[PDB]
Amino acid sequence: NLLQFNKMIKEETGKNAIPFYAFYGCYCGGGGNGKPKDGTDRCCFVHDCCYGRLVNCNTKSDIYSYSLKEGYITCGKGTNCEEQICECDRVAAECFRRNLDTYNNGYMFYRDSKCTETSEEC
């Protein structure tokens, strides 16, 4: 579920999905395309790529079991889809945390028209 991933994003970055990630560079938020704007944007790109591999799962709705001991995100048991989605989510949540040092405010709400590049392959 997007609310869980959004939870992780906050638990890892101390920031909030919306706005900080709702729309960033060209991949955060609603799909997107072109070429990643930067580290953080690269994270959303990969995440978008992750969900894609799971064509048969309501990546945004399906709720999954996960924990959070000492900042380490655990994915409980569930269904291929629930487990998979969890696994896409935490790698991102962590990816964002690993890029905090170069987050660019200017890329927040970065227009997708400016994303005039050859879409990166997954």
mmCIF file of all heavy atoms in Angstrom, residues 4-28:
data_model
loop_
_atom_site.group_PDB
_atom_site.id
_atom_site.type_symbol
_atom_site.label_atom_id
_atom_site.label_comp_id
_atom_site.label_asym_id
_atom_site.label_seq_id
_atom_site.Cartn_x
_atom_site.Cartn_y
_atom_site.Cartn_z
ATOM 1 N N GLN A 4 1.863 2.784 3.380
ATOM 2 C CA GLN A 4 2.929 2.092 4.090
ATOM 3 C C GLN A 4 4.264 2.594 3.557
ATOM 4 O O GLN A 4 5.144 2.987 4.327
ATOM 5 C CB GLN A 4 2.820 0.600 3.841
ATOM 6 C CG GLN A 4 1.409 0.127 3.623
ATOM 7 C CD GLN A 4 1.239 -1.286 4.079
ATOM 8 O OE1 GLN A 4 0.856 -2.161 3.309
ATOM 9 N NE2 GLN A 4 1.540 -1.529 5.352
ATOM 10 N N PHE A 5 4.415 2.570 2.235
ATOM 11 C CA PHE A 5 5.642 3.058 1.612
ATOM 12 C C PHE A 5 5.856 4.494 2.070
ATOM 13 O O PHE A 5 6.965 4.892 2.411
ATOM 14 C CB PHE A 5 5.531 3.016 0.084
ATOM 15 C CG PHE A 5 6.742 3.563 -0.637
ATOM 16 C CD1 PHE A 5 8.018 3.442 -0.095
ATOM 17 C CD2 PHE A 5 6.604 4.190 -1.872
ATOM 18 C CE1 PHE A 5 9.136 3.940 -0.776
ATOM 19 C CE2 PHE A 5 7.712 4.687 -2.557
ATOM 20 C CZ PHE A 5 8.974 4.564 -2.010
ATOM 21 N N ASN A 6 4.781 5.269 2.085
ATOM 22 C CA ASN A 6 4.873 6.655 2.510
ATOM 23 C C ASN A 6 5.331 6.704 3.963
ATOM 24 O O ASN A 6 6.029 7.631 4.377
ATOM 25 C CB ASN A 6 3.520 7.347 2.343
ATOM 26 C CG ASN A 6 3.208 7.676 0.890
ATOM 27 O OD1 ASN A 6 2.053 7.677 0.475
ATOM 28 N ND2 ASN A 6 4.242 7.954 0.112
ATOM 29 N N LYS A 7 4.944 5.693 4.732
ATOM 30 C CA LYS A 7 5.324 5.617 6.134
ATOM 31 C C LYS A 7 6.826 5.396 6.207
ATOM 32 O O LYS A 7 7.524 6.094 6.944
ATOM 33 C CB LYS A 7 4.596 4.463 6.827
ATOM 34 C CG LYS A 7 3.843 4.867 8.092
ATOM 35 C CD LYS A 7 3.379 3.651 8.893
ATOM 36 C CE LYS A 7 2.043 3.093 8.378
ATOM 37 N NZ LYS A 7 2.011 1.590 8.333
ATOM 38 N N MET A 8 7.314 4.425 5.429
ATOM 39 C CA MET A 8 8.739 4.086 5.382
ATOM 40 C C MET A 8 9.576 5.286 5.005
ATOM 41 O O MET A 8 10.578 5.560 5.649
ATOM 42 C CB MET A 8 8.987 2.978 4.368
ATOM 43 C CG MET A 8 8.258 1.691 4.679
ATOM 44 S SD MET A 8 8.789 0.374 3.593
ATOM 45 C CE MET A 8 7.447 -0.836 3.804
ATOM 46 N N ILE A 9 9.152 5.988 3.949
ATOM 47 C CA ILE A 9 9.830 7.187 3.443
ATOM 48 C C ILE A 9 10.068 8.179 4.579
ATOM 49 O O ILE A 9 11.117 8.807 4.647
ATOM 50 C CB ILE A 9 8.976 7.913 2.360
ATOM 51 C CG1 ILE A 9 8.812 7.045 1.121
ATOM 52 C CG2 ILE A 9 9.633 9.221 1.955
ATOM 53 C CD1 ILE A 9 7.876 7.657 0.076
ATOM 54 N N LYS A 10 9.074 8.314 5.455
ATOM 55 C CA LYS A 10 9.127 9.228 6.595
ATOM 56 C C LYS A 10 10.001 8.680 7.709
ATOM 57 O O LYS A 10 10.697 9.427 8.394
ATOM 58 C CB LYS A 10 7.702 9.469 7.130
ATOM 59 C CG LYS A 10 7.566 10.400 8.344
ATOM 60 C CD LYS A 10 8.702 11.417 8.443
ATOM 61 C CE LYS A 10 8.180 12.844 8.501
ATOM 62 N NZ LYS A 10 8.832 13.635 9.588
ATOM 63 N N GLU A 11 9.954 7.365 7.884
ATOM 64 C CA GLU A 11 10.721 6.697 8.919
ATOM 65 C C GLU A 11 12.208 6.647 8.599
ATOM 66 O O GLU A 11 13.041 6.547 9.495
ATOM 67 C CB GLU A 11 10.191 5.280 9.103
ATOM 68 C CG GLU A 11 9.731 4.999 10.508
ATOM 69 C CD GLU A 11 10.691 5.568 11.530
ATOM 70 O OE1 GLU A 11 11.892 5.221 11.462
ATOM 71 O OE2 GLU A 11 10.251 6.363 12.393
ATOM 72 N N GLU A 12 12.531 6.730 7.316
ATOM 73 C CA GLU A 12 13.911 6.662 6.843
ATOM 74 C C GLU A 12 14.539 8.013 6.572
ATOM 75 O O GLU A 12 15.734 8.201 6.780
ATOM 76 C CB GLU A 12 13.969 5.852 5.552
ATOM 77 C CG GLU A 12 13.504 4.434 5.696
ATOM 78 C CD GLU A 12 14.441 3.637 6.552
ATOM 79 O OE1 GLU A 12 15.619 4.023 6.651
ATOM 80 O OE2 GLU A 12 14.004 2.626 7.128
ATOM 81 N N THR A 13 13.730 8.948 6.087
ATOM 82 C CA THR A 13 14.210 10.282 5.761
ATOM 83 C C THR A 13 13.789 11.330 6.772
ATOM 84 O O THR A 13 14.353 12.415 6.807
ATOM 85 C CB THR A 13 13.686 10.723 4.420
ATOM 86 O OG1 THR A 13 12.293 11.022 4.557
ATOM 87 C CG2 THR A 13 13.873 9.618 3.381
ATOM 88 N N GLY A 14 12.802 11.011 7.600
ATOM 89 C CA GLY A 14 12.341 11.980 8.576
ATOM 90 C C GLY A 14 11.579 13.057 7.835
ATOM 91 O O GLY A 14 11.238 14.101 8.391
ATOM 92 N N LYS A 15 11.318 12.782 6.561
ATOM 93 C CA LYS A 15 10.596 13.690 5.685
ATOM 94 C C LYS A 15 9.234 13.076 5.372
ATOM 95 O O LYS A 15 8.963 11.949 5.756
ATOM 96 C CB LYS A 15 11.385 13.891 4.387
ATOM 97 C CG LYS A 15 11.801 15.327 4.134
ATOM 98 C CD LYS A 15 13.285 15.509 4.337
ATOM 99 C CE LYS A 15 14.061 15.060 3.113
ATOM 100 N NZ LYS A 15 14.679 16.216 2.403
ATOM 101 N N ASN A 16 8.378 13.805 4.670
ATOM 102 C CA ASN A 16 7.067 13.272 4.335
ATOM 103 C C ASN A 16 6.878 13.103 2.836
ATOM 104 O O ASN A 16 7.192 13.994 2.049
ATOM 105 C CB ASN A 16 5.975 14.173 4.900
ATOM 106 C CG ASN A 16 6.232 14.556 6.347
ATOM 107 O OD1 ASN A 16 7.332 14.990 6.700
ATOM 108 N ND2 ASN A 16 5.216 14.399 7.193
ATOM 109 N N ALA A 17 6.364 11.945 2.448
ATOM 110 C CA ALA A 17 6.135 11.640 1.045
ATOM 111 C C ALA A 17 5.614 12.870 0.318
ATOM 112 O O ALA A 17 6.186 13.316 -0.673
ATOM 113 C CB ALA A 17 5.140 10.501 0.927
ATOM 114 N N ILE A 18 4.516 13.413 0.821
ATOM 115 C CA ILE A 18 3.917 14.604 0.244
ATOM 116 C C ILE A 18 4.327 15.760 1.149
ATOM 117 O O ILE A 18 4.037 15.738 2.346
ATOM 118 C CB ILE A 18 2.386 14.491 0.225
ATOM 119 C CG1 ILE A 18 1.954 13.490 -0.844
ATOM 120 C CG2 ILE A 18 1.768 15.843 -0.050
ATOM 121 C CD1 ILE A 18 0.643 12.810 -0.542
ATOM 122 N N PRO A 19 4.977 16.799 0.591
ATOM 123 C CA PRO A 19 5.359 16.993 -0.809
ATOM 124 C C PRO A 19 6.694 16.368 -1.221
ATOM 125 O O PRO A 19 6.826 15.818 -2.321
ATOM 126 C CB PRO A 19 5.394 18.507 -0.944
ATOM 127 C CG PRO A 19 5.850 18.971 0.397
ATOM 128 C CD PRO A 19 5.407 17.942 1.418
ATOM 129 N N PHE A 20 7.676 16.476 -0.333
ATOM 130 C CA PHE A 20 9.031 15.978 -0.550
ATOM 131 C C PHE A 20 9.291 14.857 -1.544
ATOM 132 O O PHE A 20 10.391 14.770 -2.085
ATOM 133 C CB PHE A 20 9.633 15.615 0.793
ATOM 134 C CG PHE A 20 9.762 16.780 1.704
ATOM 135 C CD1 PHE A 20 8.914 16.926 2.789
ATOM 136 C CD2 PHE A 20 10.707 17.761 1.445
ATOM 137 C CE1 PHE A 20 8.998 18.037 3.609
ATOM 138 C CE2 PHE A 20 10.802 18.878 2.257
ATOM 139 C CZ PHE A 20 9.940 19.018 3.346
ATOM 140 N N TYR A 21 8.315 13.997 -1.793
ATOM 141 C CA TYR A 21 8.531 12.932 -2.753
ATOM 142 C C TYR A 21 7.349 12.732 -3.684
ATOM 143 O O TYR A 21 7.487 12.116 -4.736
ATOM 144 C CB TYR A 21 8.874 11.626 -2.023
ATOM 145 C CG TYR A 21 10.154 11.734 -1.228
ATOM 146 C CD1 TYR A 21 10.127 11.852 0.155
ATOM 147 C CD2 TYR A 21 11.394 11.811 -1.871
ATOM 148 C CE1 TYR A 21 11.293 12.057 0.883
ATOM 149 C CE2 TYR A 21 12.565 12.018 -1.150
ATOM 150 C CZ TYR A 21 12.498 12.144 0.227
ATOM 151 O OH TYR A 21 13.634 12.410 0.937
ATOM 152 N N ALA A 22 6.191 13.259 -3.308
ATOM 153 C CA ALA A 22 4.992 13.106 -4.128
ATOM 154 C C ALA A 22 5.329 13.340 -5.592
ATOM 155 O O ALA A 22 4.910 12.580 -6.462
ATOM 156 C CB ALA A 22 3.917 14.073 -3.668
ATOM 157 N N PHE A 23 6.088 14.400 -5.853
ATOM 158 C CA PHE A 23 6.531 14.740 -7.202
ATOM 159 C C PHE A 23 7.935 15.300 -7.070
ATOM 160 O O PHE A 23 8.145 16.322 -6.408
ATOM 161 C CB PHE A 23 5.629 15.788 -7.838
ATOM 162 C CG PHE A 23 4.418 16.103 -7.032
ATOM 163 C CD1 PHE A 23 4.513 16.898 -5.905
ATOM 164 C CD2 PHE A 23 3.179 15.597 -7.394
ATOM 165 C CE1 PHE A 23 3.398 17.184 -5.149
ATOM 166 C CE2 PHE A 23 2.053 15.880 -6.639
ATOM 167 C CZ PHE A 23 2.168 16.675 -5.515
ATOM 168 N N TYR A 24 8.893 14.615 -7.686
ATOM 169 C CA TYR A 24 10.293 15.009 -7.636
ATOM 170 C C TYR A 24 10.915 14.588 -8.947
ATOM 171 O O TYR A 24 10.498 13.589 -9.535
ATOM 172 C CB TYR A 24 10.989 14.285 -6.488
ATOM 173 C CG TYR A 24 12.370 14.801 -6.177
ATOM 174 C CD1 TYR A 24 12.589 15.642 -5.085
ATOM 175 C CD2 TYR A 24 13.460 14.450 -6.969
ATOM 176 C CE1 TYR A 24 13.857 16.121 -4.795
ATOM 177 C CE2 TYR A 24 14.725 14.925 -6.686
ATOM 178 C CZ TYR A 24 14.916 15.761 -5.601
ATOM 179 O OH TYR A 24 16.163 16.249 -5.325
ATOM 180 N N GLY A 25 11.902 15.342 -9.414
ATOM 181 C CA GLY A 25 12.538 14.977 -10.663
ATOM 182 C C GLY A 25 11.485 14.521 -11.649
ATOM 183 O O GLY A 25 10.434 15.136 -11.757
ATOM 184 N N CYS A 26 11.736 13.421 -12.339
ATOM 185 C CA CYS A 26 10.787 12.955 -13.327
ATOM 186 C C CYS A 26 10.209 11.572 -13.081
ATOM 187 O O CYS A 26 9.475 11.056 -13.927
ATOM 188 C CB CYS A 26 11.441 12.992 -14.707
ATOM 189 S SG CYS A 26 12.167 14.614 -15.116
ATOM 190 N N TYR A 27 10.515 10.956 -11.944
ATOM 191 C CA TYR A 27 9.971 9.630 -11.703
ATOM 192 C C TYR A 27 9.193 9.443 -10.429
ATOM 193 O O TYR A 27 8.347 8.540 -10.347
ATOM 194 C CB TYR A 27 11.068 8.603 -11.801
ATOM 195 C CG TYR A 27 11.356 8.306 -13.225
ATOM 196 C CD1 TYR A 27 12.387 8.951 -13.890
ATOM 197 C CD2 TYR A 27 10.578 7.404 -13.926
ATOM 198 C CE1 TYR A 27 12.639 8.705 -15.225
ATOM 199 C CE2 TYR A 27 10.824 7.149 -15.262
ATOM 200 C CZ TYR A 27 11.861 7.805 -15.904
ATOM 201 O OH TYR A 27 12.126 7.536 -17.228
ATOM 202 N N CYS A 28 9.473 10.285 -9.441
ATOM 203 C CA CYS A 28 8.746 10.208 -8.187
ATOM 204 C C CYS A 28 7.268 10.500 -8.482
ATOM 205 O O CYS A 28 6.944 11.252 -9.397
ATOM 206 C CB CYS A 28 9.320 11.209 -7.191
ATOM 207 S SG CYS A 28 11.077 10.903 -6.833
#
